[PDB]
Every structure is written in structure tokens, then in C-alpha cells.
């Protein structure tokens, strides 16, 4: 009953973890992974405090889920990513660590080879200063192919720095202006295709401005999911969500650029 807190997670689809780290290592340098009964999670802001990432890998997605206490692993995400890049895409990945431990161990098992790789990395002490996200009501929600959203963010960012996202009865519009000219891209609901659908729930029209630089870092999650969801309300950061298979999500929150008063 006076147990040492342990973490031991076995994930059969190792690639999900490889893609998750690629999704956040450039936005955030150092962060805590948190260990609960709900699953393996992380929340952290970028260094300018304009964007926040929240991820969840649910316990059910793990072939073995041992998370003994309310354990946290402080970690350099770029170093972790460098280790996970050495895992094959079909490798089984096991993370093991001790609550106050000095290191974390990643085990990569090949499901077809009888190759076992042990990678070990130093942990660091990071102060958990987490923000509560309220369960709020969005004025408009848009789901669309992730590759389409990624294409739009790249194309707009070659024109200018700021994108206006608007939803109206006509559809969702993305607009930018820069030195070379102006660009508007309008998407309308289209369900007569399944991951290629555009689905738009508009409770009220919304329009907000965002820095494209942050949106383009969000699209590094594109290989995680064939679709992406964008939730907008005039009173909140935009929320950009990619599904992690059917075992969780990465949600990116980005504070808007607004008119001075």
C-alpha cells in the first residue's frame, strides 16, 4: 500500500505515439506527461502563451495500462521525438518510468522480427501549472479533411501572416492579405462524397483572426487523422482537434487577434 508510483504503458500501434510527438515538439519544448485513470495526457502552452496543446491517449487504447499514482514525467519533447523516430512504424512501444525517477525507458518491440530496442532518457522537473478549460458552447463547428485544412494554411501563409476565419450560412471562409495581394477561400457543406466530407454546424455566425504561424504548426498533426475539426466562438480561442485513432485526441487552442478598443 506504500507503493512506489510506476508508469508502464504498452501501445501496439507505436506509430500513433511517433506522430503525436511530431505534432507537438515544435510548438512546445519541455512539458509534463500526466498519468491518470482516464489515460496518458499532456497540456502545455507555447513559449509565447498564445497557443495551448491538450492531448489525451485513453487507457483503453493501450494493450497494457499501468499508471499506479498521479504521476508526472517532465520531458524534453525534442529528445523524446528523436528517440521515437528510431521506432519502426509497426513497432510496439512501451514506456516505463518511476514517479520521482531520473530516467524514462522506451522499449520498441517488433511484432514480426524478434528485435527489442531499449532507449533511455533523462527526465526533468517541470512545475505543473495547468489551466482549467471550461466546457463551453461554440458558435460554429467545422469538420473537414485534414489535408485540405493543411493546404489552406500553407497557401494562405505564402500570401500573408493573418487569417480571418468566418462561418456564415454561406459556409466557412478563410481570408488573408499581404504584400502580393489578397486571397479568400470559401468552403461549403458537402456530405455527398466520408473523410472527404465538409460538415458545418452554425449556431451563430462567427468571425475571428489568427496568426497563421501557429495554425501551420498545428497542421503537423495532419498524419494523425484524415479529418480535422475547428470550433469557433466569439468569446474563446479557436480549437483545432485531430483524433488519435479512436483512442483520444490532440486539441490545439489558439488565442485570436482582435481589434484594439
Amino acid at each position: 500500500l506504500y507503493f512506489q508510483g510506476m508508469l508502464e504503458l504498452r501501445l501496439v500501434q507505436g506509430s500513433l505515439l511517433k506522430k503525436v510527438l511530431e505534432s507537438i515538439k515544435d510548438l512546445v519544448n519541455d512539458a509534463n506527461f500526466d498519468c491518470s485513470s482516464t489515460g496518458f495526457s499532456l497540456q502545455a502552452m507555447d513559449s509565447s502563451h498564445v497557443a495551448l496543446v491538450s492531448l489525451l491517449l485513453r487507457s483503453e487504447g493501450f494493450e497494457h495500462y499501468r499508471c499506479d499514482r498521479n504521476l508526472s514525467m517532465g520531458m524534453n519533447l525534442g529528445n523524446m521525438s528523436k528517440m521515437l523516430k528510431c521506432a519502426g512504424n509497426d513497432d510496439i512501444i512501451t514506456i516505463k518510468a518511476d514517479d520521482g525517477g531520473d530516467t524514462v525507458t522506451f522499449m520498441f518491440e517488433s511484432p514480426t522480427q524478434d528485435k527489442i530496442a531499449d532507449f533511455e532518457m533523462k527526465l526533468m522537473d517541470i512545475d505543473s501549472e495547468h489551466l482549467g478549460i471550461p466546457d463551453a458552447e461554440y458558435h460554429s463547428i467545422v469538420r473537414m479533411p485534414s489535408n485540405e485544412f493543411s493546404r489552406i494554411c500553407k497557401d494562405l501563409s505564402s500570401i500573408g501572416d493573418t487569417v480571418v476565419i468566418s462561418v456564415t450560412k454561406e459556409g466557412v471562409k478563410f481570408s488573408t492579405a499581404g504584400d502580393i495581394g489578397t486571397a479568400n477561400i470559401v468552403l461549403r457543406q458537402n456530405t455527398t462524397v466520408p473523410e472527404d466530407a465538409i460538415v458545418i454546424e452554425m449556431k451563430e455566425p462567427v468571425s475571428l483572426s489568427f496568426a497563421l504561424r501557429y495554425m501551420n504548426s498545428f497542421t503537423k498533426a495532419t498524419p494523425l487523422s484524415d479529418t480535422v475539426t475547428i470550433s469557433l466562438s466569439s468569446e474563446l480561442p479557436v480549437v483545432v482537434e485531430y483524433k488519435v485513432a479512436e483512442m483520444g485526441y490532440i486539441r490545439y487552442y489558439l488565442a485570436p487577434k482582435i481589434e484594439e478598443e
Binding site: E129, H130, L131, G132, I133, P134, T162, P237, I258
Partner: peptide, 13 residues
């Protein structure tokens, strides 16, 4: 030029 808001303006610790 628009003003960039911060996540801390929306969510509390």
C-alpha cells in the same frame, strides 16, 4: 494592426 490576445485571457489556472 490587430492585437494578439493570450490564452491566459480566457482560461484560469
Amino acid at each position: 494592426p490587430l492585437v494578439q490576445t493570450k490564452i491566459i485571457d480566457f482560461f484560469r489556472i
